[PDB]
Design a protein around this ligand. Structure first.
Ligand SMILES: CC(C)Oc1cc(Nc2nc(N[C@@H](C)c3ccc(F)cn3)ncc2Cl)[nH]n1
Ligand SMILES: CC(C)Oc1cc(Nc2nc(N[C@@H](C)c3ccc(F)cn3)ncc2Cl)[nH]n1
Ligand SMILES: CC(C)Oc1cc(Nc2nc(N[C@@H](C)c3ccc(F)cn3)ncc2Cl)[nH]n1
Ligand SMILES: CC(C)Oc1cc(Nc2nc(N[C@@H](C)c3ccc(F)cn3)ncc2Cl)[nH]n1
Ligand SMILES: CC(C)Oc1cc(Nc2nc(N[C@@H](C)c3ccc(F)cn3)ncc2Cl)[nH]n1
Ligand SMILES: CC(C)Oc1cc(Nc2nc(N[C@@H](C)c3ccc(F)cn3)ncc2Cl)[nH]n1
Ligand SMILES: CC(C)Oc1cc(Nc2nc(N[C@@H](C)c3ccc(F)cn3)ncc2Cl)[nH]n1
Ligand SMILES: [Zn+2]
Ligand SMILES: [Zn+2]
Ligand SMILES: [Zn+2]
Ligand SMILES: [Zn+2]
Ligand SMILES: [Zn+2]
Ligand SMILES: [Zn+2]
Ligand SMILES: [Zn+2]
Ligand SMILES: [Zn+2]
Ligand SMILES: [Zn+2]
Ligand SMILES: [Zn+2]
Ligand SMILES: [Zn+2]
Ligand SMILES: [Zn+2]
Ligand SMILES: [Zn+2]
Ligand SMILES: [Zn+2]
Lengths: 260, 261, 258, 261, 261, 258, 260
């Protein structure tokens, strides 16, 4: 087997963890995978041939990716139904639902914790940029939280995440590394607002207006100005002026070791 | 193999355990399935040889292989290359729960601590299902099985409407959810405590449907304490959102099983 | 397996090394390939069928071609997307970029320059002995590894082409020596583009009207005699690659130093 | 596998040994083919990727795997799944017999005991063929190979007419038999003793065909004793039934090889 | 041809008459369809190009070609080789009956002799259907059309449940018959006399379904004589066997149309 | 035959009229098409299958669309290469080139300019009444025939696009009026490119920030009121094409003259 | 039938007229074609599917072409063997064989006759250029001669006519309208030399040398300088400086009415 295959008979389902557009994610016990262990099992609903292709293709890419801050892929089973993709279990779920339930609405995550969360997401994004891979949908809803506040990028995939997109992506549909930094800036903003929807008051069309008009999201209260500088560096009008995710990660890593 | 395949040459049929719409269930010996040689198993043998049926059977197998719980019937494997199509499960010697209830009732019958253990056990199976967001759609005692030690498990997944066990929202607005399954479980509790009596037995399908649709609840069984009948009643709320959680229903039943009134 | 298969699952991408027309090359870690190690992964963008069979055939040839100065082919996977070809990792990148970096814009000495040249020529002798015509020999298509190891890394580049290939479209092992001559020039000019002053058109006129490239500042006359030997107008009058390599190897070990 | 398959990953090409119409022959190393690791082999690499050609190549391989004789080139295996199509044989370092003869002649040359051993060796190969009722149809020194120790073997099976080596019955009445092969062997003897000279070299194809058709025999070579030229003459009878048996031809040559005139 | 085919080159689109789920309806000119050259027609142009949809469309055409009645919309032909799929019908200039009723009401409106002629005309169409044992399943004024001369015809055949127009047996026990169609016609009579008001407009789908299921009838409209409301009531019996025959319903309405109260 | 077929043999090419992305348009003589005549032949370069079925469908629509101000579709041949679509010949070419030619670089008068505009609007009323959204209405896509007959000739042109189509990708009959407004401007500026001073990017910023195009020198205020009516930011607040056409037709017959 | 079909049964073959690469051209009698007549029948040898396609495609193009100086196409029959294409009969054969047998090697064609031949070929070429169609192989071997010195373009179709090609076609394989004028210039030269091979002394490689070197063919003896001016206008180095075939035709037409 070329991509790793996980036998259905080795997967015992425990309970549902959550729902995506694609279908369902369960907690499972997986027997004989590393020398029983808990795993997350993504199970596809669609069952068609177009979707079965995309699923295989995703498994094909993901077997080759491997990083401390990308969710660990274990294998696939595409012969049979539902189509299964198995990953490491991150018990605290998605980063957006986590921020919202660990903020003011132990107490809220402290500044240093927020900077650790930001730094981990950024680290994942340096791996992707270095691979010349464009995510296109970086958002806190697409990140996962493990025990002990380990955070990893959890998902890689017309519907558009318009509030996270820069002007040039809204207008010209150009997705690059530098549009991913833009989205990262908005991720920073989500982190420091404890999971708020960017431009939440506004409707989608009003959000587009603001983004296209050059209007920046406000500095969150929990957000020190040096972090807001980082946001603004992600939010330059011209893509080539925008900071590298590498610079962005370094700056946050430095900030997280000796916080202001 | 991805799903466990059971070789026909490893099965010897003993006698028929029962019949269904799908075909037949036999008691069989199975050679080298688990690490002694021979062991007794139940073999679901499919009537139709249709390619559509052969698919569904394949689909069913690749669901059940991933399920596993103390209160769901254990699935061992399948063979779909040949006739009849075979699915192998653990042998539950006392057969289906409905016929069992009717057999160990006033027509010694089953005590309270016993009838409670039976209901607790079904509920456990149903917590597993609800936790998976799996909707059963046909929970009834005819679809549960009883093994040695009064072990009881969910035995069938349905696969024509069981209108009497259905709540108003499933009949009228055609909605099947995890809370339509707690309803049916309520009707299952009623089955257990009436020793397998059909719900609304005097009534026909045309009038049962009217009865439930207007909010007429089932009468309390003789053998049934009113704390128990409360659990049934919590399952029978008109509005789905009001109904009890199977987790809670099960917690109560597991409680009453330790301290029986 | 007939061609060696690299299981997708034994690959972990590290980062992109460079881009081609074919797609992308990545640095990866490879799990149990020889009795963890670093490899170069060629990932094809095309995904079609013309290109998918073309990739298989390329792998079927490369599997049998081994030489100390041809980049090592480890294996393939065409069962999946993207199509993968895995090679040895040559840490210093293409030889043109390397020449530009280690040039006067600390420079490599005569003996290093001659080692580079000797290695490219060794790869070219293997090819000519197989009767394989390269057609696109240029420093951009060679790779540099640890220790100044240099190998041929890739298989109209008019500036490297002789008159018969421009005019009459004849490609032979003797047109390959011509190109090697031009490669020698690139090495000794620290990676300069041949005929850089002129444009894509006025260069072909220069090649056609018998004009030879200037002797580079860093180039001993005995090396220029090698180039000039590659650059005879008559294909059969051109020096054999085998004699060119012999000479360059001798001079790399025992140089003229100025 | 039925025919031995040689994995591409076990072949490393060294350099081209020569060209044919089929494609190319290379010297290669072969890893684990016979019980040491590496050994030198010759690799016939096919130009055409046609499905008809791919079949013929497959057909050729499944003949040659069954052949084996000291004086037929040893076939090791094939690979037909991939491009180019590969057939692997033993390496004969001195190449084809014609170019060898021309190289070790007056243009020290080859002695009599040597030239006889060469002819004896070809004949041995041809006895094997006649004993199998296999008709070669294109025996000529260009189709034999020479290895270390002056070992000589049949190297090619033909696979456009070699009119000069053909007898009148093959030209006129188009008949190819085991006795048209002894004819050609006679012309091969003439090749050996002229050190690789083309038969009827001054003549063109149009007139060679006339020459043989009217019964004009080839002239005796300088280096050739008349007992030897007798053997050639026995091969050149107008009537096939009159011609010598390759077994006898070989017996004579093996005799003269021990006691050279 | 078996079904009349209308060549695309004979249709010129004028403007869109309306939209449906299927796609769009246009007013078009049609050249040489009936023995003058040009005539106005309605063209149903299908959105989906699916092969399953293309079949259904073909199936629909080969039913409608056999139907013909003064009070069913006249079908002229089809073209299914090309996109979009086309079905051609007679042009009914005043559009659907619901929007017409709303337009010629208190929000001069329509008299009694008029509203009666409208209901008589629908009923006539429905007698034809019942006589063929054809069950409509979705009779409503939105599915009737109005042409010049206040001519009204059934315009659509349905092709998601119109729960408000459905009787209890169709909701509960899922039974569609000719008598579930007289029910719906009763609700159509109510539509006509309320000038196109939605039945149970204050109520939502969840509660309408409860309302009809328990036997709550619709209120008598202002413009509606009680002899007329009797006809509606005859259509609304709980038991299908008790309901009036559309033939009788139509006879009454044709009677009242001559002698209006 | 369901769609009208033009037999290849009834066509004789005269010369090329122009080029598109689709391929080429030729002037041809057509033999027995209506009870010899000149036609425009659209010959498709693509020849594939995606494009070959696309061409058939285009013909299947066009066959049913007839209007005095939509270029007349005569027939098709997809049985052969190249794929052919035959239309009426509009001798004066595209309306943009025509406006540039007959402009101050003898000029058309107010009444002629208004006739041109009225004709384009008439074509747009037919389309909007069919609920057909054009998406690319510009003078380059209209044709001029003998007698100043003007018709719509073809089915991101950001400069003709309204804010909702740039920003939110919404294309409606009300975005088509917006484009018609811009067409009015082109007519009255004798074929000038809207926002010609600015570039492809600074124009979209101008559209987005509510900036209207300047009233052309040749443009009476009552015509500018028409444009401005097409150029309301709110789609539902924009004038209907039917009212725009009524007005322009009235003004073409009874102009303000200055 | 979309392209005109000629029934085999209406074609009676008379004798072979000549040979192409494609096969044979016969003289035939064709019954019921215009209201018996002689026609030339091109018959394909190859018989494959690749070639049967190209044949259909050629017939598809040629049914739409029609000009006084392009050979008249009548129809095709592709169902059956050989594949047949029928054209008008031009009884004097190809223009090259005609020049060679009507020159010094009535007497030779006079200047005015040579200018009529040139003008007719040019006229054919104005039609092609106006259609934006590139011939790629204009040569006298590809023209036909009818009774009364009517001359038409006879053929429209790696092997390269290198002596007729300009540098930019030799080097870059760019074939345009302006490379067709180049070839026309060489056609003029063939006409005024009574059918001589351009660069006949030289080999193909030597011809390429001369063309690439910028060396022009010499003025033929039968050629007045005003005609040689026309040749030179076809032979400019830069394609955009080269004269239009329209100008070239006018100049020759003027020269043929009032010859110098
Ligand atoms: C890539 C996924 C299958 O790996 C996961 C997910 C979890 N745990 C949880 N996942 C979810 N929701 C899923 C749909 C999800 C997946 C990816 C993502 F970025 C966000 N959300 N909800 C709760 C948990 Cl505990 N472990 N491994
Ligand atoms: C899932 C089944 C095949 O596993 C079983 C059945 C038994 N024992 C018996 N089963 C039956 N009737 C069968 C048709 C049945 C299956 C499922 C169910 F929920 C109820 N009834 N009759 C008698 C016996 Cl002893 N063991 N394992
Ligand atoms: C044949 C290739 C896959 O083997 C390689 C490449 C490297 N390292 C690098 N390669 C490149 N650029 C690639 C596109 C390349 C490949 C071949 C070639 F001749 C020139 N350039 N850039 C940087 C590095 Cl470090 N190792 N093995
Ligand atoms: C059957 C062949 C592949 O086995 C061989 C050939 C050699 N060595 C050489 N072969 C040749 N020419 C080849 C084409 C050849 C093959 C057969 C034959 F009868 C004559 N020539 N040229 C040089 C050498 Cl060294 N070894 N084994
Ligand atoms: C069966 C139809 C195509 O025949 C028609 C429709 C009309 N006129 C109009 N139709 C509509 N809406 C269409 C969608 C419709 C069709 C059937 C139906 F029962 C109700 N509505 N809107 C306006 C008009 Cl004028 N004539 N013939
Ligand atoms: C729809 C076309 C085939 O109908 C035409 C075109 C003409 N005449 C001319 N067309 C053109 N350019 C073509 C590409 C064109 C087509 C449509 C369009 F809207 C604009 N341009 N150029 C000159 C002429 Cl004379 N008649 N009929
Ligand atoms: C296009 C052709 C079939 O039309 C022709 C040819 C003739 N007459 C003659 N053709 C030939 N040779 C043929 C091969 C030929 C065809 C075209 C061309 F440009 C040159 N040569 N030889 C003698 C005659 Cl009489 N009539 N119609
Ligand atoms: Zn599997
Ligand atoms: Zn890249
Ligand atoms: Zn089996
Ligand atoms: Zn769920
Ligand atoms: Zn693989
Ligand atoms: Zn070779
Ligand atoms: Zn192989
Ligand atoms: Zn025999
Ligand atoms: Zn049709
Ligand atoms: Zn019936
Ligand atoms: Zn046609
Ligand atoms: Zn619409
Ligand atoms: Zn025919
Ligand atoms: Zn063109």
């Amino acid at each position: 087997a070329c991509v790793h295959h996980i036998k259905r008979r080795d997967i015992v389902l425990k309970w549902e963890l959550g729902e995506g557009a694609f279908g369902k994610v369960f907690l499972a016990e997986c027997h004989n995978l590393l020398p029983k262990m808990l795993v997350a099992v993504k199970a596809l609903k669609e069952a068609s041939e177009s979707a079965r292709q995309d699923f295989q293709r995703e498994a094909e890419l993901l077997t080759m990716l491997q990083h401390q801050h990308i969710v660990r892929f274990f294998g696939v089973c595409t012969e049979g139904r539902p189509l299964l993709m198995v990953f490491e279990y991150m018990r605290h779920g998605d980063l957006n639902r986590f921020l919202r339930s660990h903020g003011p609405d132990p107490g809220p995550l402290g500044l240093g914790q927020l900077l650790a969360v930001a730094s981990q997401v950024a680290a994942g994004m340096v791996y992707l940029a270095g691979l010349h891979f464009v995510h296109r949908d970086l958002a806190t809803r697409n990140c996962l939280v493990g025990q002990g506040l380990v955070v990893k990028i959890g998902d890689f995939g017309t519907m558009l995440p318009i509030r996270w997109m820069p002007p040039e992506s809204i207008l010209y549909r150009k997705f690059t590394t530098e549009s991913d930094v833009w989205s990262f800036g908005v991720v920073l903003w989500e982190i420091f607002t404890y999971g708020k929807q960017p431009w939440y008051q506004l409707s989608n069309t009003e959000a587009i207006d603001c983004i296209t008009q050059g209007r920046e999201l406000e500095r969150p209260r929990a957000c020190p100005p040096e972090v807001y500088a980082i946001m603004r560096g992600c939010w330059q009008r011209e893509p080539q002026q925008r900071h590298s995710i590498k610079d962005v990660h370094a700056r946050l890593q430095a900030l997280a070791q000796a916080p202001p």
